[PDB]
Amino acid sequence: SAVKAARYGKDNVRVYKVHKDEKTGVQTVYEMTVCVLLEGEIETSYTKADNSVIVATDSIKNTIYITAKQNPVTPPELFGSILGTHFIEKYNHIHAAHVNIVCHRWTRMDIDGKPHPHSFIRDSEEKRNVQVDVVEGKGIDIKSSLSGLTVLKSTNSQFWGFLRDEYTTLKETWDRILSTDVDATWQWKNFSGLQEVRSHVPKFDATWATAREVTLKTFAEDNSASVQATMYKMAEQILARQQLIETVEYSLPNKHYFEIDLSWHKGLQNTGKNAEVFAPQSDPNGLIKCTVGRS
Template identity: 45%
Template sequence: MAEVYLKSNRYGKQEVKFLKKLVDKHDPKKQEVIEYTVLILLTGEFTESYTKEDNASVVPTDTQKNTVYLLAKLHDFSQPEVFAAIVANHFTSLERFAHVSGAHCEVTQHRWSKMTMSTGERHAHSFYRDGEELRTAVCDSTRKGALKVQSGIKNLLVLKSTGSAFYGFFKDEWTTLPEVQDRIFSTSVDCSYSWAAFASLENVKSYSATFGKAFDGARQTTFDIFARDFSCSVQATMYKMCSQIISQFSGVAEVEYVLPNKHYFECNMEPFGIKNSGPDATIYLPQAWPAGRIQACVARKAQAKL
């Protein structure tokens, strides 16, 4: 048998789901809800559980699940970044977890919005699932190091029916793609932005309001630039988005966008004697695969310090 060694390992619990009700202290009928899906991964002195069938150091994944529920009950929070930090810090700060050297926690927030009544008022405690867009947060914590936090947006499906072109690209003998001066631009936005390192959990908590403003700001920046900017390429558009978010929020160290193409191509109606191309195009056919995938990470030259 070949000589081997355990190069790396980590383990945890995924798809831990809960909904928390936030009740207004002055008017109990005024409520908000947050629904999270949580992933935890631990690293540390777990080698012998793999190599010697010794589970003495293993924190059961069921215990990790229970920990998520209990921390959600015992702590006040309204931002996924704060809860991710609470969970990660729990496993890297308590003495009973001395053998745990690092914790990785991902929190996905599902979108619930309040119902608007016929009077124009938002109902105090009734909600609807507002699309498949997700808000994300990640925290990595080590026993002696700082907390690293990343925020994000996923599954934000956007489309504009004009105001986008693609021309002047590299061509060789295998190129068949025609240049276009006007096209449909659609993508599913995956945006993540990393914060300068936080020294402590309390430091993360102090940024609670900023996390909310940054999420709203990143989302609005995505809309503004996507809609208003004439796009010469997905690459140019995402670079402008990244740069704007970094300029808006001093604590953000870098921003990454992943924008896969959601293609819509003109339907060929020439066999029927009908023009449906160029300026006459109004009917388009969606094509799922293959699809372009464009991504970029833009960083602040002088790192922000919290």
């Protein structure tokens, strides 16, 4: 037998950082969960019980805190690239670092129509994520995403004209509820190293904001022919607005809300045009994915 692939590291490292403006008194907080996995010339730890090649996962944890102390933690694309580069440069035998960051929302509170200097609210479990792969001699690959963005529209969604055969019971519809949890990932062109990532720093927050805005507007305004068709429109627009993105991937559940026929009870009308009360279905759910790239 032989080791074909190996990676190891520390997962679920929770980190909080505060920035304090001494001039204005304003404080800004960041909170993340970080995972770092390393690869390189480490086979002997598996095959020969040779621990000399192991950077302890505990040390990886310490390194995350030290790096956060000495560097900006935002945008997360930059912090991830700094952290990954550290490992491949510091250790001769480590040749790849894989850094995953989940950013948690701490939104500044408005109290009496004024932004508060040091108080924050978690407005939704929506996350902003990065995956950064730093590979020695091959640069830095960054995938940025948003996830956990949960939306619903109560009309202006249709689904008709699908394949009908002996397995089909679904009725065609011209008016249904559409609800999903959005997972959207944009993959950046490969960067040569940290200097190049630094050169593009302003594009990271701007592209996240664009991806979010395009997703929300398209969902709200499209008279949707299917999840497939609406999601493609979203992806097309993001690619048009940021030339440094190579691909956009969406993964969308279709969270079903069923009509409830109440006609058995005193002829109560609650279907089609008369539908007011629906039963949200926890499971099963449709799952629709697509990756869109350039011609």
